[PDB]
């Protein structure tokens, strides 16, 4: 009942911003560009410092012409409209957004701990208590997002940041979409795609719960449940209905994952009459205090190392590229509402 009350208020706040999005709330020249933190098909994220406050941020720079060539116009509009409207302890905040002749800009909170991806690959795998701590945060984040009729659609260690307190911050809302009922877009990352996506079946929020199963598996195993050298081989494994677990996986863990990695939607945890509660109440989560997690009162598995503000040693190095702004406006109409 307290959960319903909280979510009801959360939706009221979200819908106000959803219907009236913030737009043009800063300018490129207000930020000092320092270093690239990550890259994508049509842009990059750079560590920046806001000159008037001295605050550090992570600024995503999207080349409008590249967005259009990859047919991601509506997805980029989705991303910005959603991210400026949401608010949850484990979601990165969009602080400013604006555009110029050449690029779109999304100025987000900088999360100095780096990607879960980097730590997971380096350490090999997380213990189950460690993986559970992260997993719980995704569970609550998805409960929140789904209550707003949003689907996230790109869960993976590369899209999860670790903050200074050791907590998760979900970023990368590029495929996030607000949809009541059913949607069809083939998108995501091969290892994490639900069978209904690759089979072009038409799908809903249940694909996020499948992806959570993939994520928990990979965190606790050190490798995903479905992997191969070519995506087609990955897809063949995903739809096959077969999954094998490391012998070190607990029996509770295996039970949870068999229910999350359920090819049959009518049997998938997160998608039954009991909704997210079949997950929250699963044996594997019996020690999880969902409220303490939300309030950030639980001791994290580890805190990332930090050496003063603006330090980036928790991020890989990327090739840098000067930002150029054309003297002509590119793709004005397509991105008008940004």
């Amino acid at each position: 009942e307290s959960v319903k009350e909280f979510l009801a208020k959360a939706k009221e706040d979200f819908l106000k911003k959803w219907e009236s999005p913030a737009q043009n709330t800063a300018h490129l020249d207000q930020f000092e560009r320092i270093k690239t933190l990550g890259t994508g098909s049509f842009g990059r994220v750079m560590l920046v410092k806001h000159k008037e406050t001295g605050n550090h941020y992570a600024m995503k720079i999207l080349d409008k012409q590249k967005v259009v060539k990859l047919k991601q116009i509506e997805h980029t509009l989705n991303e910005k409209r959603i991210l400026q409207a949401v608010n949850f302890p484990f979601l990165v905040k969009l602080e400013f957004s604006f555009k110029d002749n050449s690029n779109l800009y999304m100025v987000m909170e900088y999360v100095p701990g780096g990607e879960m991806f980097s730590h997971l690959r380096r350490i090999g795998r997380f213990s189950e208590p460690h993986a559970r701590f992260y997993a719980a945060q995704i569970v609550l984040t998805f409960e929140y997002l789904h209550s707003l009729d949003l689907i996230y659609r790109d869960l993976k260690p590369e899209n999860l940041l670790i903050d200074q307190q050791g907590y998760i911050q979900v970023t990368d809302f590029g495929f996030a979409k607000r949809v009541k009922g059913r949607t069809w877009t083939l998108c995501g990352t091969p290892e994490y795609l639900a069978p209904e996506i690759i089979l072009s079946k038409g799908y809903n929020k249940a694909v996020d719960w499948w992806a959570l199963g993939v994520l928990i598996y990979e965190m606790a195993a050190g490798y995903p449940p479905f992997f191969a050298d070519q995506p087609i081989q990955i897809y063949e494994k995903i739809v096959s209905g077969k999954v094998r677990f490391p012998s070190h996986f607990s029996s509770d863990l295996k039970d949870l994952l068999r229910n999350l990695l359920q090819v049959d939607l009518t049997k998938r945890f997160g998608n039954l009459k009991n909704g997210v509660n079949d997950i929250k109440n699963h044996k594997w989560f019996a020690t999880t205090d969902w409220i303490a997690i939300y309030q950030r009162k639980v001791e994290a598995p580890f805190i990332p190392k930090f050496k003063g503000p603006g330090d980036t040693s928790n991020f890989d190095d990327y090739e840098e590229e000067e930002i150029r702004v054309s003297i002509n406006e590119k793709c004005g109409k397509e991105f008008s509402e940004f």
């Binding site: 098909s41 995501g188 490798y223 992997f227 191969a228 050298d229």
Partner: peptide, 20 residues
């Protein structure tokens, strides 16, 4: 081992999204 197979695979680096 499954772990050794993973580490020798071409997909232990960052994975690109697909679409379209």
């Amino acid at each position: 081992t499954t772990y050794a197979d993973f580490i020798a695979s071409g997909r232990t680096g960052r994975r690109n999204a697909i679409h379209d």
